[PDB]
């Protein structure tokens, strides 16, 4: 436990515990699910209420006309990386007059979060980014981690009890490349309902859906346009 | 053996042969200090000389003689010398003096004052008012850089002697002794073993002779082939390299 | 791999006379490069000592005559050169020196009974001069011990030979197979110090002996050589009871060796000078022990 | 002990400080030994190599480091600290030639190296570079020189030099060696530079296990010997 | 706890040394190492009247300890310890014993009754060889 | 130390009828006891084979160690991070080796009776010496295996009487067949390894933390005896476990079943194991208003 | 390192706590203010 | 121990455990080997699939530093990414200041001094990475380098980094690499990866082979192993 | 608990770390300074470990200006720092005032340098005391600084190992006036007081201050004084 104080101190087993603890901060946030077809990348998140009459805290947030991100973890590092995220996108619009490739944007984030994981005097960023995008080579789903190991993936779910969503996605990932915009969304929100205790239901007021498409700008829906998506579902198999 | 002969004059020759010390006219039954990094020889020399015309040899680990209550560590030292005055030829052996040897200083308030009073009892009952007669003391520690100068002055520990780990030729000697009563074919390239062997410890060389036997028992051989040694040398050299904090800095 | 060295060994031991002797020295560096090799199983040290065993034996056939200057000069130039193709230590500490030098003193054990003093003391000094500074440590020590015990019998003892062995006693007590060989070697120089009439030197080294007591058990002639020097040492002094206590050991050992006159010399030496001791209670009980015996009436000094 | 736990670079009541004198035993984890000898107009570095693997190369192992055209050196201690020590030596040798317009003396270079090591002792918050450096060079109206620089910031110049694991044994030889009056005629030097090391370690190489740097007042360039001429001197002292 | 037990053993010692009773004809002899450490209540006279310091030796007392040890010793030479009376790097009085003891070992070690004055220097360098590194550093 | 029958006035021994005690020493006799497979233990087949090289091959090749010119060891020491693998492997050892097993625990020696630690040490060893194939088990010997450098060993008046008498008897008997002695401790760094070193407890058998699949099957073996819902993802159970021994893995399974008793449900779930995970190290969650 | 009439009570109760209780009917509850005095042998399952 | 928190302190015997600790974090990484033929350098990485949702070429450990230089990292992957950007940036300054391509002997010196600087100060930690450097030129031939976390850098003919560092170079050294062409090497790298630990304690892995030499005209790129698939066709023949 | 840092006090007395640094001065080589009627004599003790070390490489008596010399007793590598500091600081006077700096004026300033390393909190103080000499405006001067930052003026003093014997010697051995030659004869006699071996021309090293400037002696000059030295 005497090695468990700073980011600088290695362990006698080779495992820095402060990075291992920031992984646990990602599991404090709610679950969120991202996936993609050949033409459409959809990420769906789960809101959480603070009280009975307060508004639900938002998860999906717009970045650029072809990139939107989800969130899990500390809200301090959420807006801190978002302001770095939005700044880099409009610089490529200002200098190169093109949108950024999504892949090389994420490499800037890994270089960003690397330095506070090695120098003393700054904690790592406890955060759980899921990124959807469109470069010239189609849709992408990316995840990051506070250990700065960014992963390319075709479907992913992170947050609290998000393993049950992953087991759903493995037995349906073959079906995802061919379906259209419509059931791809409700392939995705069939995965969130296993990250719920079986006594409550996925309503309108607690879920957000963001879609970016090949000919579609990144659009966030909430609480009213979710009802065309929530129709055509079965109940839970109890 | 060069240190062994120097050990035997000051310990064996008093109790076996006092007439030589009366020709020139000289006393000493005093005792030695064996300093040298651990594993080499610091106990066997004590045990070898405690076989040649033996008597009631003692063994003290010098770390079981400390506990909570304050007047007990002196009480053990007083008793062990009273036993030595009981049986008149006697050899005291105390490994790792550095535990209670130490040096005196200003304030260590809680624990250190007991240790120094434990030390002064030991320091002044082997050179006390009573003449310690017919009793010899062998002190052995792997550390000693910090000992009490009152412990180190000649008169109490009259001659010190150093013990080194290798030679490449004492390596040749220890290997032939521990690979002594072991059935083989005489196919033993001892030197190329010793060339590969950086064992630094006859306990490691005892381990090499132990493991080379075990690989000979593997695949059911009544002999020992020379390859069983090279399997044993690579295992023992690997097992040594898997250890940390193994400092070698004596005086 | 060393079977080529075996058919090298086949070639030389027939052709020492058919071929010239320097051709054996032309086969020298190839076996010396084999002596470098000694790797795993085939050209290893154990077989490498054998080709050195053959060339030393073939040299002793050639240098069996008084022309001994081949075997001495080639061997020294061998061990120098195979160091000199390298640095520090020859090829291995064990074989190539000490198994060959064990044969050197073995061959010296054979030719000592015939050859004159000159080429053997050239031979003994050239194995002195190689174990003085070169290959001198343990592995092995007893080979020079038995060599310097053979070195000392040349001029049969003088001032030089006593000092020649006193310099080489003090080391050889660490081990030296203490079961006879050290004990025989350590009583050899005390008669030498009696020959140079150094009596204080003798009784210091005589005081070393007796902890190997009961040496009458397996051997017998070790005992008599000890006390016959012990009685001579005090004979320059006078502790006359101490010789008679020694003579008791001289009495009871050849009695079981069944002597009829040699036993009587030991008996009549006892009965002579317990008398010459000054009077003491130790004289009184000793004459009460040594008299009244059925072995003693043979002499008119029973009455004395 | 009095026991300050010696965690940083401060004093002890005995009067000394332990972290710097822990760096002197930091050399010993190299497992290596180096010898410099100055006898006459020539000066000789000699140092063994240790190649443990056949996959490992041979050319990229050498500890002989050419500082300038007329100044070479050898490094002991741990490897990574040794090469960064050389980079300051190559750098400040070139600032001398730039600022002052002539070639730097071998004596002045060790003052610059030892003063860099002094600041790390005086001021904290940098590990003090556990490696040792031995130099050679020719100086006009001075002959050749040999210098050693310590991790404490100490330097001195002296004739026969040992470093690495076996200082006390090799220096015990050279006192017994350099007490007579020799003239050291460049094969007298190289032979003892072998045979000082050729009482110590008991090895026997075929001639590919050492390195020899040399400098001479007939060609003051620094010079690393060829494997062939190493073999020549290895049988030239050696009959 | 138990450090005031040490401290009260002082006080009982101070009482039965200078209390009311004044136990006559008893005598107290004490001997320590470095005595600047201890209690000034001991050091007041009336209780510890005599303050006697022992130096190591000095010169002209090295001679006297050389005499008294070698008197009962078969030195019997013409090579004197005068070279080793006047050495610096002072040598405590128990060490003079060890010099004669080591030479006594080293006389019998080559089987002599006599000290032949080359052993005497081997004995001298054995007992005196202590400070060996100093790292050529802090002078 | 015998309970001899002495006359009142003459103070002379008339009878003895000694050695009368209580049911704890009676409870030490375990012979021909049920079978746990070595193959049930996964991933530690080395330490199984190392034990065969240590003890079983002495029993197999009794004379191959005698004509060769070496000595079979008689002290083999098991150690690891925690148990479930210390007792459990030793439970696997005498399950299929039937040669008169004899277990013994640590503080069972510790009595209020002075010296009857050392009396019970020697008399059980001498009883095991009277049996011809009997091997000796010692459980939690680190309870007296002590004497580390500064802070511990605390005294004592039972540790030294039991440790020395252990060192007394273990040097007493010859190291041949078949009175091999096995000690079971937790950690060598509490023990005295270099004091034993030669003919005493010498062979070091280290244990690691078990693997994911090993902990996953430890769940299903322990969950056999209860009503479990047959919707169990052991891949979920393998990876969710971390820094858990099989003792805690048994505890998770029992705590999952106890929570299903709290709500009165007949079956389990993986969440019930996850709730058991929160119950073992006493975790408790909420909404924490940092995390959106 | 006690063993003066406290352990007489203690060793006898832990003797009779197991041994005579597989599948019992009488439950026993302990209560204290000091969590120092927890026995892991009690907390070994079967007892507590 | 109790002397091993900072990397600025020595042990009482004279070493730094924070460097010692970071070396055996690389030991838990998967095995990546390297080998050079007489006209090029061939890399090879055993890389294992995380679960299933890896997308077939994500987070690769074969980097591309310059036109003719690439890396074969192993250890903490994110720490190697930042370290690779140092090497990418270092070759650009040599191009801008000297007008030609960076020599590999000089490039390894510039990186290893930068790795060395993190082994001194208490404010930073040492890197938890180790990697390979391969290149090829017509004026210099092929070279192959090796950098530990301490900063020690020198050249090999074959090497391995990972769990089976010893268990791989046991059978690298039984190859006559001085005369083989690198097209023959590619099928020989395939068996060395496939010999050690296909799916024993793991589930699945995937092979990555980088490739520089005379056949690529000095370029450094991935093999066309989607072409001809000859690695797995030949490595899986060692089942018997 | 106060003996590990520098920026805080003890509840009763003074700074602990500066007192520990003065213990390092006592474990240095011995050195003697004597102020005569017309000059100042410095003298030190220079024994090498082995025969191998060259004596003409490193010097102890060291000039600062043409009339200002300087020795020490402490740690040699820290000595070279503040020598090079005192060199450059002596020129800065001369660039301003076009006049050689008086010996009272350096020791104002050199002590202010040694002052600054006694500040907070991650630096160590020096382990060197100094002896500074010079002949400015007829009268000579002999000063002594320390790692604390104080500075004085001795008639004669000694520092290093066994200084208390040399203090008691020179307390008996000083008068008001001798010549510069008789000061040299009594400065070697006090260095011989605590010495181990044959004092040759290379075991010691002596520099003086005339009114005609500062100079250190050659080994031939130091031989001929040590030849027939009492
Ligand atoms: N020179 C040697 N000759 C014979 N045995 C040796 C030698 N050196 C070590 N050993 C073996 O090593 C073991 C450890 O020796 P020991 O004296 O206990 O080490 P230490 O000196 O540290 O106490 C012994 O059992 C002994 O058999």
Curated annotation (Swiss-Prot), chain A:
Sugar-bearing residue positions: 107
Coiled-coil parts of chain: none
UniProtKB keywords: Acetylation, Cytoplasm, Glycoprotein, Immunity, Isopeptide bond, Nucleus, Phosphoprotein, Proteasome, Ubl conjugation
Disulfide cross-links: none
Annotated compartments: Cytoplasm; Nucleus
Sites bearing Phosphoserine, chain numbering: 107, 174
Induction: Induced in breast cancer tissue (at protein level). Up-regulated in liver tumor tissues.
Cross-link position per record: Glycyl lysine isopeptide (Lys-Gly) (interchain with G-Cter in ubiquitin): 112, 205
Xref: CDD domains: proteasome_alpha_type_1
Keyword Mitochondrion part of the UniProt annotation: no
Gene Ontology biological-process entries: immune system process; negative regulation of inflammatory response to antigenic stimulus; proteasome-mediated ubiquitin-dependent protein catabolic process
UniProt KW Membrane keyword: no
Annotated Gene Ontology cellular component terms: centrosome; cytoplasm; cytosol; extracellular exosome; nucleoplasm; nucleus; proteasome complex; proteasome core complex
Pfam family of the protein (one): Proteasome_A_N
Any GO MF annotation of the entry: lipopolysaccharide binding
Role of this protein: Component of the 20S core proteasome complex involved in the proteolytic degradation of most intracellular proteins. This complex plays numerous essential roles within the cell by associating with different regulatory particles. Associated with two 19S regulatory particles, forms the 26S proteasome and thus participates in the ATP-dependent degradation of ubiquitinated proteins.
Family note: Belongs to the peptidase T1A family.
Entry protein name: Proteasome subunit alpha type-1
Natural source organism: Homo sapiens (Human)
From Swiss-Prot, chain C:
Organism: Homo sapiens (Human)
Subunit structure: Component of the 19S proteasome regulatory particle complex. The 26S proteasome consists of a 20S core particle (CP) and two 19S regulatory subunits (RP). The regulatory particle is made of a lid composed of 9 subunits including PSMD12, a base containing 6 ATPases and few additional components. Interacts with ERCC6.
Gene Ontology biological process terms, A to Z: proteasome-mediated ubiquitin-dependent protein catabolic process
Family, similarity comment: Belongs to the proteasome subunit p55 family.
Coiled-coil stretches noted in the UniProt entry, renumbered to this chain: none
Protein name from the UniProt record: 26S proteasome non-ATPase regulatory subunit 12
Known function: Component of the 26S proteasome, a multiprotein complex involved in the ATP-dependent degradation of ubiquitinated proteins. This complex plays a key role in the maintenance of protein homeostasis by removing misfolded or damaged proteins, which could impair cellular functions, and by removing proteins whose functions are no longer required. Therefore, the proteasome participates in numerous cellular processes, including cell cycle progression, apoptosis, or DNA damage repair.
Covered range of the whole protein: 1 to 304 of 456
Record keywords: Acetylation, Intellectual disability, Isopeptide bond, Proteasome, Ubl conjugation
Acetylation listed as a keyword: yes
Curated annotation (Swiss-Prot), chain E:
Function: Component of the 26S proteasome, a multiprotein complex involved in the ATP-dependent degradation of ubiquitinated proteins. This complex plays a key role in the maintenance of protein homeostasis by removing misfolded or damaged proteins, which could impair cellular functions, and by removing proteins whose functions are no longer required. Therefore, the proteasome participates in numerous cellular processes, including cell cycle progression, apoptosis, or DNA damage repair.
Gene: PSMC4
Localization of this protein: Cytoplasm; Nucleus
UniProt modified residues of type N6-acetyllysine: 118, 122
Domain of life of the native organism: Eukaryota
Subunit structure comment from the entry: Component of the 19S proteasome regulatory particle complex. The 26S proteasome consists of a 20S core particle (CP) and two 19S regulatory subunits (RP). The regulatory particle is made of a lid composed of 9 subunits, a base containing 6 ATPases including PSMC4 and few additional components. Interacts with NR1I3. Interacts with PAAF1. Interacts with TRIM5. Interacts with ZFAND1.
Family: Belongs to the AAA ATPase family.
UniProt name for this protein: 26S proteasome regulatory subunit 6B
From Swiss-Prot, chain F:
Keywords: Acetylation, ATP-binding, Cataract, Cytoplasm, Deafness, Host-virus interaction, Intellectual disability, Neuropathy, Nucleotide-binding, Nucleus, Phosphoprotein, Proteasome, Ubl conjugation
Post-translational modification: Sumoylated by UBE2I in response to MEKK1-mediated stimuli.
GO CC entries: cytosol; extracellular region; ficolin-1-rich granule lumen; membrane; nucleoplasm; nucleus; P-body; proteasome accessory complex
Localization (cell): Cytoplasm; Nucleus
Molecular function in Gene Ontology: ATP binding; ATP hydrolysis activity; identical protein binding; proteasome-activating activity
Main location: cytoplasm
GO annotation terms (biological process): blastocyst development; modulation by host of viral transcription; positive regulation of proteasomal protein catabolic process; positive regulation of transcription by RNA polymerase II; proteasome-mediated ubiquitin-dependent protein catabolic process
Residue numbers binding ATP: 80-87
Residues with PTM Phosphoserine: 229
Taxonomy, superkingdom: Eukaryota
Function according to Swiss-Prot or TrEMBL: Component of the 26S proteasome, a multiprotein complex involved in the ATP-dependent degradation of ubiquitinated proteins. This complex plays a key role in the maintenance of protein homeostasis by removing misfolded or damaged proteins, which could impair cellular functions, and by removing proteins whose functions are no longer required. Therefore, the proteasome participates in numerous cellular processes, including cell cycle progression, apoptosis, or DNA damage repair.
